[PDB]
Design a protein around this ligand. Structure first.
Ligand SMILES: *[C@@H]1O[C@H](CO)[C@@H](O[C@@H]2O[C@H](CO)[C@@H](O[C@@H]3O[C@H](CO)[C@@H](O)[C@H](O)[C@@H]3O)[C@H](O)[C@H]2NC(C)=O)[C@H](O)[C@H]1NC(C)=O
Ligand SMILES: *[C@@H]1O[C@H](CO)[C@@H](O[C@@H]2O[C@H](CO)[C@@H](O)[C@H](O)[C@H]2NC(C)=O)[C@H](O)[C@H]1NC(C)=O
Ligand SMILES: *[C@@H]1O[C@H](CO)[C@@H](O[C@@H]2O[C@H](CO)[C@@H](O)[C@H](O)[C@H]2NC(C)=O)[C@H](O)[C@H]1NC(C)=O
Ligand SMILES: *[C@@H]1O[C@H](CO)[C@@H](O[C@@H]2O[C@H](CO)[C@@H](O)[C@H](O)[C@H]2NC(C)=O)[C@H](O)[C@H]1NC(C)=O
Ligand SMILES: *C/C=C(C)/C=C\C=C(C)\C=C\C1=C(C)CCCC1(C)C
Ligand SMILES: *C/C=C(C)/C=C\C=C(C)\C=C\C1=C(C)CCCC1(C)C
Ligand SMILES: [Hg+2]
Ligand SMILES: [Hg+2]
Ligand SMILES: [Hg+2]
Ligand SMILES: [Hg+2]
Ligand SMILES: [Hg+2]
Ligand SMILES: [Hg+2]
Ligand SMILES: [Zn+2]
Ligand SMILES: [Zn+2]
Ligand SMILES: [Zn+2]
Ligand SMILES: [Zn+2]
Lengths: 305, 338
């Protein structure tokens, strides 16, 4: 076998050498060297020490600033809060997992690792949706503390309809690559949870569609200021595709070819790269939005414009 | 002329267009697009956001935990401060400079930016020598009965500061000088102009000899000695392999150092030789700026390879509890000598 399956895992390595051990009981240092694991744990340490200040600052500013209540400001606060969950709920476990070369925290840790990452990306994928329409309405012209809170609520509803099932009984979060990150069970059919039907679902209801919607809405496209809130949204959407296509693409190749001879590094890259999703959004924000950039500076200098 | 030489600078651009302008009076947008200056400003902003906490937590942890006092634990508190000094002393001035397209605060803004980047780079280099030594005295069977105390640790720290100031202070006093580099938002040692009357051709030879080759010779010869025992393998104050974990670490900090300062040192030596030659702004911006990650990686390695210190910041961050010999002044921090 080009792989080693367990009742709850799947290590991309042949146990013909009788060296493959569970990602839950012993380090996976027989997959890659101990330097690449501490390298991952360093990356995770950085993502943590940036994802926190940057998302929380963002959170503290829109909350602190009285005149910061645009749907954009709402969606961007959302991401800042989802990015914080990613960081504490998820990044916490993935940091300590790498520091041990396996899931020391057990499955509760694998679930923590995957739920917040999927919730993370899905809230982004869904908030990018709540934004695309707003731009078909304030630019293609067919809001506020009213409707933005429904889009913001809706993003959690939808994201949760994706990150929540593998926790209860539809699909399962399972260690990927160097067995340090967890994601949807693309690897096995597992008749018991038919993650074969969940992947066909997640890929359509939480990937394909949400995207085509962000597309035709875009294809079907103060009065001069909306061009920069647009160019931002456009950019936000593009940066998301860069985090998730490398992943989602790799994730699908595997779902269809369940059994191939791929290695651990194969999915470790698109998967660990994708975690910048927790930090990248609030950077585009300062960059192309004179309103926030200035208001953030005011939160820092305590008044000196 | 391939470059406009001023009494204070050297813009790597040609003024046969009159488009060049003093990096102390106007933005250097003519040297390259505005968005590139925006990326430097973003980049510096992200470094200041990381270098601060990472370095400050590293700092706050060592002080609070009363038994975290080995030469290593010491020499690494030194780096958190030097890095914080970079973050505030230099980095604050490098981000304002990028945001505005030139050195608005002028020559002192160039001095603070260049001084604290050199000071921090050298606080680093020399600390690697006090540590490369520390390693020897412990691993390759040295002395006869000796063991390091806190006292020895402070002398190495005091030494690194004198050796870093010995390199960074002169350009503020008249020996060589801090001049803007690349896109003109970073400041370093003058390798560009002869300026025979501040002794430029002189200092650069001194700095590269005394503040680069030598410490590297020593650090490399010590590492050559620590092959008698600790070859290359190492697979926290617990047993025999507690030192092998420190040595393997101290041996990584040297590799990181290289990757960080070689590019800069390399492209900087090129210039000193090929002065007046045709190079662009971008040329030096990259090594220079990448090198600025120097204010951030040391504690990253520390809290990654030191099982004792890590659990210690995890103890600090978790208010005292935590769900390896206990040294954090949190968890039976009582003495255990003899
Ligand atoms: C991969 O194939 C090897 C065959 O070489 C399997 O080896 C077996 O590994 C399990 C744990 O993965 C061992 O069980 C445990 O043994 C220890 C003592 O060594 C005991 O304390 C535990 O309670 C448990 O019984 C088993 O001894 C070992 N047997 C062999 C062949 O050495 C291995 O299970 C396979 N890995 C997987 C799970 O895919
Ligand atoms: C082990 O991995 C190899 C390589 O991915 C698999 O071989 C391929 O199998 C597909 C059919 O699913 C063929 O179309 C390819 O031509 C094969 N490639 C080769 C081997 O040249 C193989 O099926 C895998 N073994 C298992 C466990 O199914
Ligand atoms: C490049 O050549 C131009 C050609 O004049 C210089 O421009 C003059 O600079 C002085 C001093 O800053 C100004 O007072 C003049 O107004 C400029 N001349 C004009 C109006 O064209 C420029 O200084 C040279 N580049 C540098 C700064 O070295
Ligand atoms: C202007 O720049 C040119 C090119 O960068 C300098 O000319 C160099 O002269 C050497 C002499 O050995 C030639 O071999 C090179 O081809 C030239 N450039 C290089 C190093 O590639 C010239 O000296 C500069 N002019 C001044 C004096 O500033
Ligand atoms: C680092 C941990 C990771 C990447 C775990 C899980 C990720 C997912 C379940 C992602 C799902 C998707 C998202 C977030 C956006 C594009 C579509 C998708 C299904 C690949
Ligand atoms: C971002 C600003 C910078 C990097 C300014 C100045 C840097 C130096 C003077 C560096 C000197 C050196 C160090 C720190 C270590 C290797 C040798 C060296 C001379 C290149
Ligand atoms: Hg749109
Ligand atoms: Hg990205
Ligand atoms: Hg404001
Ligand atoms: Hg050494
Ligand atoms: Hg570096
Ligand atoms: Hg500790
Ligand atoms: Zn099962
Ligand atoms: Zn299938
Ligand atoms: Zn010369
Ligand atoms: Zn640990």
């Amino acid at each position: 076998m080009n792989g080693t399956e367990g009742p709850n895992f799947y290590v991309p390595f042949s146990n013909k050498t009788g060296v493959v051990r569970s990602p839950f009981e012993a380090p996976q240092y027989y997959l890659a060297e101990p330097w690449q694991f501490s390298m991952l744990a360093a990356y995770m340490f950085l993502l943590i020490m940036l994802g926190f200040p940057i998302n929380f600052l963002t959170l503290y500013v829109t909350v602190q600033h009285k005149k910061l209540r645009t749907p954009l400001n709402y969606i961007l606060l959302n991401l800042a809060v989802a990015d914080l969950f990613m960081v504490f709920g998820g990044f916490t476990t993935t940091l300590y997992t790498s520091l041990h070369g396996y899931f020391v925290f057990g499955p509760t840790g694998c679930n923590l690792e995957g739920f917040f990452a999927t919730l993370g990306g899905e809230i982004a994928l869904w908030s990018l949706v709540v934004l695309a329409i707003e731009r078909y309405v304030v630019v293609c012209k067919p809001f506020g503390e009213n409707h933005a809170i429904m889009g913001v609520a809706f993003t959690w509803v939808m994201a949760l309809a994706c990150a929540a099932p593998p926790l209860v009984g539809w699909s399962r979060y399972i260690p990927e690559g160097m067995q340090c990150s967890c994601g949807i069970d693309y690897y096995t059919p597992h008749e018991e949870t038919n993650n074969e039907s969940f992947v066909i679902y997640m890929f359509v209801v939480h990937f394909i569609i949400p995207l085509i919607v962000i597309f035709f809405c875009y294809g079907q496209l103060t009065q001069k200021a909306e061009k920069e809130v647009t160019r931002m949204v456009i950019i936000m959407v593009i940066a998301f595709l860069i985090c998730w296509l490398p992943y989602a693409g790799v994730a699908f190749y595997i779902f269809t070819h369940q059994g191939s001879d791929f290695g651990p590094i194969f999915m470790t890259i698109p998967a660990f790269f994708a975690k910048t999703s927790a930090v990248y959004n609030p950077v585009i924000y300062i960059m192309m939005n004179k309103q926030f950039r200035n208001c953030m500076v005011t939160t820092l200098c305590c008044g000196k414009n």
